[PDB]
Structures are given as structure tokens and as C-alpha cells.
Symmetry: C2
Subunit: 324 residues, 2 copies
């Protein structure tokens, strides 16, 4: 590796659990393991915290007093960023959109959005995040003009820097699995930092394992370029090469980002009832539905054990109830 060049804050501490799922395994007729990255100590957890360890460390080095990011009203990333800002005495400004055009009260005011208010997040609404990076720059300039020193975190925290958090996650995965068959790894692939980070990390640590990203917002055609771009950026900045192909399945997110679907909700119900594990309607439920259908369709490279990366998202359950 030799990746320990980048400054980082310790938000997690201990490696997150890697667990066997004996009831799901028995039901599916396949060995399933889970990386519990939904279990991190800050504000109901999630994958974005691993990214923020690097991103907020960078922010501090720059002497920032404000964090600015963007996402949907129910963004897990925004909530995790708001919580970290609170913890560190930093202001937080969030640029928020309603990506599904709902007026359902729990989507609008409960779940992750409720938490934002608890963290004293400054909320800026926009009609659509059509150009996130650009819109974030305009906000940052406005906030700076008010007398603050802002630091911009991209949507999903998915820069090459943010993605370092998932290179780190792979190291944990590597050591946690050295006593396991191993065949495949499944993760939700959205803003792509998690996917890319694991891609780089797993190429070097567990080259025999197939990494599958189940998309939550885009076709394979729209997503692969994003993931490759980040994979190569991470690789360069760690003085490695990344030659592994990127595997994506885009069948499991219709009709769009932040809209639940039946396979997704049924995946949520299955994991909850068989294992007492909570997924979410936007991300992990869709990714899991992808895993299950992979077994249905004999879609994995071989029939060996599968590792699902639980990236979090469960507070959205309370926003999506009863419907959107």
C-alpha cells in the first residue's frame, strides 16, 4: 500500500465487523458474508464517514470553518457531513434537491432531513442539482463573501481523496477474510467513490475476487466512465496501477435514484426478517436485490462465497414510510 501519506481524522477507530449471514446463506443456498460499514459511531453511521476522514482532514489543513456539500433531501452523505461539522465546531451548509418530486411529509421533514435540523445545518434549496460542482462553487463564493472560510465536499464525497476511505476498507476486508472461500463482492455504486476505492484496494489485496457494483442512479454506460476515472485517479495518487475491469449491473434501480422498487423493498424485508439487519430503499436494498438476482440468474463468475458491503442508509426508512 504505502497510502498513509494523506492526513486523516479518526472517526471510526476499530475495523467495522465482517460477519457471516447463516440464515440468508441457508435460504439462498450460497455463503453470504457482510461488511458492516453501517455500524460506525457517528450519527447512525454509513460509508460516507470513511470518506470524510480524509476530506475533513484536508478541510482543516486549509483552515476552513465551514463545510459545504450537496445532495437529495434524504442524502446520507449530507447528514454524515452535518454531524461531523457539528462535532468539530464547523458550520455546515447543504444544497438540497427533491429528486423525486414528492410532497410526502416524511420525505420532506423526517429521516435524514430531521437530523440536519438537529445538527443546525444551513439549508439551501435548489430546483435541481444539474451541475453540482458548479452550483457548489457559487454557494461557496456567496458564503465566503459573508465572512466564512468554506471547504467544498463534492456530492457523495466522491473525489479521489474521499475514495481513499474505501481503499482503507479493502485492507480491513483483506485481513478479515484470510480465514473464507471468497469468490465475489457486491456494493451499491452511486457517486462511485466507494466502488472505485474498493476496486483499487481489492485489485492489490484480493485479485481473485470479483467486485460487482450495483448501480442506484445510472445505466452501466453512464456509470462505468465515472468509476474508471476515479479508479485511475486513486491509483495514480497512491503510485499504483489499476488494470482491473469495472463490473456493473444496472438492472436493479428502476425507475430512478431515490425511488424504491419492489425487489429493493423485498431485499430490505428479507435481510431484516432472516438476519435482523436493516438495509435501505435507496441504496443497500437495491444493491442486495442485485446480489439475490445474481444468484437467481447464475450471474457471478462462480458459485463461491459472496461479500456484501453494507454502506448504510437505514435512517431513510423513516423518511420513506409510509410512501413517497
Amino acid at each position: 500500500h504505502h497510502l498513509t501519506r494523506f492526513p486523516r481524522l479518526e472517526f471510526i477507530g476499530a475495523p467495522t465487523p465482517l460477519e457471516y449471514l447463516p440464515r440468508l446463506s441457508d435460504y439462498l443456498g450460497r455463503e453470504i458474508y457482510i461488511k458492516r460499514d453501517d455500524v460506525t459511531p457517528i450519527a447512525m453511521g454509513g460509508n460516507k464517514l470513511r470518506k470524510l476522514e480524509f476530506l475533513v482532514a484536508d478541510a482543516l489543513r486549509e483552515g476552513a470553518d465551514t463545510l459545504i456539500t450537496a445532495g437529495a433531501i434524504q442524502s446520507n452523505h449530507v447528514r454524515q457531513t452535518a454531524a461531523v461539522a457539528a462535532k468539530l465546531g464547523l458550520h455546515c451548509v447543504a444544497l438540497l434537491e427533491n429528486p423525486i418530486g414528492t410532497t410526502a411529509e416524511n420525505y420532506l421533514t423526517n429521516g435524514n432531513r430531521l437530523l440536519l435540523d438537529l445538527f443546525n445545518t444551513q439549508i439551501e434549496m435548489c430546483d435541481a442539482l444539474t451541475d453540482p460542482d458548479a452550483q457548489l462553487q457559487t454557494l461557496a463564493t456567496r458564503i465566503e463573501a459573508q465572512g466564512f472560510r468554506p471547504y467544498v465536499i463534492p456530492v457523495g464525497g466522491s473525489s479521489a481523496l474521499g475514495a481513499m476511505g474505501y481503499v482503507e476498507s479493502a485492507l480491513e476486508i483483506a485481513q478479515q477474510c484470510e480465514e473464507v472461500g471468497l469468490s465475489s463482492v457486491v456494493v451499491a455504486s452511486g457517486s462511485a467513490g466507494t466502488h472505485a476505492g474498493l476496486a483499487v484496494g481489492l485489485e492489490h489485496l484480493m485479485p481473485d475476487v470479483e467486485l460487482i457494483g450495483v448501480t442506484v442512479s445510472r445505466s452501466v454506460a453512464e456509470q462505468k466512465p465515472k468509476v474508471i476515472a476515479l479508479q485511475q485517479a486513486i491509483a495514480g495518487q497512491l503510485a499504483l496501477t489499476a488494470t482491473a475491469d469495472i463490473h456493473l449491473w444496472d438492472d436493479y434501480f428502476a425507475p430512478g435514484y431515490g425511488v424504491p422498487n419492489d425487489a429493493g423493498m423485498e431485499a430490505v424485508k428479507l435481510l431484516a426478517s432472516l438476519e435482523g439487519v436493516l438495509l435501505d430503499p435507496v441504496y443497500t436494498g437495491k444493491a442486495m436485490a442485485g446480489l439475490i438476482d445474481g444468484i437467481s440468474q447464475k450471474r457471478f463468475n462462480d458459485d463461491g462465497p459472496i461479500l456484501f458491503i453494507h454502506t448504510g442508509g437505514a435512517p431513510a426508512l423513516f423518511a420513506y414510510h409510509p410512501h413517497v
Copy 2:
């Protein structure tokens, strides 16, 4: 050494590593006093909480008995019920929950969101009742029906608070002593005092491992006079089970729960807002927000034994935030 009889009890592994014990620099700066936090809200199972430590012992006991069904009781928004149901799902045990509406609310998020929502995800069989007037008797009656179906039920009392359940918090005290060793000299510990198992287990553990430390229970449902005998009964039962004596006086503050169990109050809400905004920590309107409100007032009014470090036990409760929003 004194707590070695704990090894005698079979126990499941739900927690794993010791939960974090963290300094709270921003809260400490505001309050003018060193505040630490024991993060029993961060557990791997279904959004965590104190109840998981009790369940390690209770469910091990159920398994030893050949039980296939966990039966328990609580409020619709009970964290205990939610954690019991999660554990039952995980182990392939059936779960039956006797629920009450403690506050007479018709708010739809209280009736259907938060913890109650999660119950359906765990396939919990739900039995409503008008009021838990006699929980032990009502749990028994329900266990008889369940048994007639051929199930093999294990009854868990409200909050998981039996002497056996309470061993989880005797165990937690051992973690706390270890984690503080060389790192900080505690003066005080603050925990919400509900069904009394958490308070009692800590009381026994802390008496033997950190006898100079002042343990304060902030009541969430009862006056000092109603609550104190419940805590003492468990304290003594726990000690007996471990071949120990427990001579420590139990301390309780009851000024922070009004107008009653499961009703939010202003100081509770302000404590929730303070912890969220200063530390990114999520408390809850029923238990921890009220206990924290007590800690804060205790500092303001100089109620503690001295001016030294305070440890807040974060027992969990956050999923209730979503059920109490926007109001009840």
C-alpha cells in the same frame, strides 16, 4: 477479580468489542466541566442500545432452555422490543410483543414510524393492549396462549430488567473501569433509570470496581420513592447471584421526566439539540435527552458530589426521534 462469577453465566456475543468511551470537548467547553460518554448506542444490531447487553444473557438463557419464541412487552416506541425482535430475527426465533400506547397519542408517526416500523421488518407478532397494568401477569397470560400453539416461549420482562438481564451492565462497568484506567479519574456517572436493570447492573459493578465514583440515575418514568425500591431489589438480586454484597446507596433524581414516561419536555428537547449541535451525537426525547437534561441541571445547581469528570452512559434511543416528529 471480584466480578469473576460473571463467567458462570452463559452469554451470546451481540456486541463484540467494548463500545467507545469518548471525551466530549465541545460539550465540556460549554458546561465548564469534563464530560465523557459511554457509547452503548453504537452496537451492530438494529440501531443499537443498552438493551442489547441484557439480551446477550437473556437469550442465552432462552436457548439453554430450548425456547423457540421470545415474548416481551413495552410501549409502541420501545427500544427494548425493537432490539428483542431484531435478535429473534437474527437467531430464527419467533417473537411476540405486547404493546401499549403510554401517552394516548394519535400521531401517525408515533403509531407507525420509528421503532414500531422496524418491528414489522422483523416479522414481530404484535399484540396490542389497553395498558400494561400488570406486565408480568399479562406476559404470562400471553405465554399460555402461545404455548397452546405448540411454541416454546421465553418471557422477557419489560426492559429486559431481571437480575440476569442486568449482568450485561455489570459487564459494562468492567469495560468502563478498564477504559478509564490511567486515562481519566471519574467523579460521577449518569444514566437514565427506567425498568432499572441498567442502573442496577452499573451500581453493582461500579461499587466493586470504582467505589469512589458517584452513580446517578435520572428517572424517566417514576419518582425517587417509586423507583428506588425497584433499583435496590435488582442491585441486591444481582449481588447475590455473584456471591457479592452491595452496600452502596442508590442515587436518583426525579426532576427531569415530567409530565411523564414517553412525554417530551423542554429541557429534554434542549439537551437533544445541544448534543446534536455541539457533538454530532443523537440523544432521544424519552430517555437520554431527559437524563442529559438532568446532568446539565446537576452541573448548573451543583448537585454532584464534586466538580470532577462526569461519564454519561449513552443507552441509545435515537430511532424514537423519527416517531416523535413532528409532534405527538
